[PDB]
Amino acid sequence: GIVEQCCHSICSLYQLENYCN
Amino acid sequence: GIVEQCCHSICSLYQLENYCN
Amino acid sequence: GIVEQCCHSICSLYQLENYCN
Amino acid sequence: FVNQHLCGSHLVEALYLVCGERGFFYTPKT
Amino acid sequence: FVNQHLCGSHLVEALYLVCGERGFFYTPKT
Amino acid sequence: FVNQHLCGSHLVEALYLVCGERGFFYTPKT
Ligand SMILES: [Cl-]
Ligand SMILES: [Zn+2]
């Protein structure tokens, strides 16, 4: 999930875009 | 106070409502 | 920088104003 | 509702949302 | 873009900004 | 004024509020 990838670890902009509709 | 109950520890919605006017 | 002075350590209002234009 | 530690401005926004038209009081000193 | 750990409401705002008109989905449970 | 550690977007909002019409500069790199 987004929490483990972006909060527990760091996400790039492209990584964050994986959660857009 | 609200800080010890909701920040140092966790508050339920009902717990938070104790601080409404 | 502002980060070392105000985030790593604590800034007074006057300290924060050092970063205004 | 969220089950997290709510601190600082985050705790204040939570109160703002929860209390609605009633308003609230934030007193960290007590 | 920022290179920081984004959590809670901060992660949500980041998504709001990044996704634009597409919107997004926030699912911490998964 | 608050006597807390101000970081990230919280530090930016603090500056926004404090500086008023003067605006400000946020440079974490320096
Ligand atoms: Cl935070
Ligand atoms: Zn925060």
Nominal resolution in Å? 1.8
Q: Which amino acid is at E5?
A: H
Distance between CA atoms of residues B9 and A3, nearest Å: 21
**Alpha-carbon separation of residue D28 from A1, B9, F9, F23 (angstroms):** 34, 14, 22, 30
- Strands, E assignment, E1-30: none
| F28 CA distance to ligand 1 middle (Å) | 17
Other CB atoms within a 10 A radius of the CB of residue F14 amount to 23
Helix boundaries (H) for chain F: 9-19
CA-nearest of E2, F27, F21, D7 to C5 is F27
- Chain A residues touching E15 at Cβ < 8 A: 2, 16, 19-20
Method used for this model? X-ray
CA-nearest of E23, A9, A11 to E15 is E23
Distance between CA atoms of residues D17 and C1, nearest Å: 35
Q: How far is F13 from chain C (nearest CA, A)?
A: 11
**Chains with ≥3 Cβ pairs under 8 A against B?**
D
Chains D and B touch (3+ CB pairs under 8 A): yes
The H or E element that residue C1 is part of is none
The answer to whether D18 and B13 have CB atoms below 8 angstroms apart is: yes
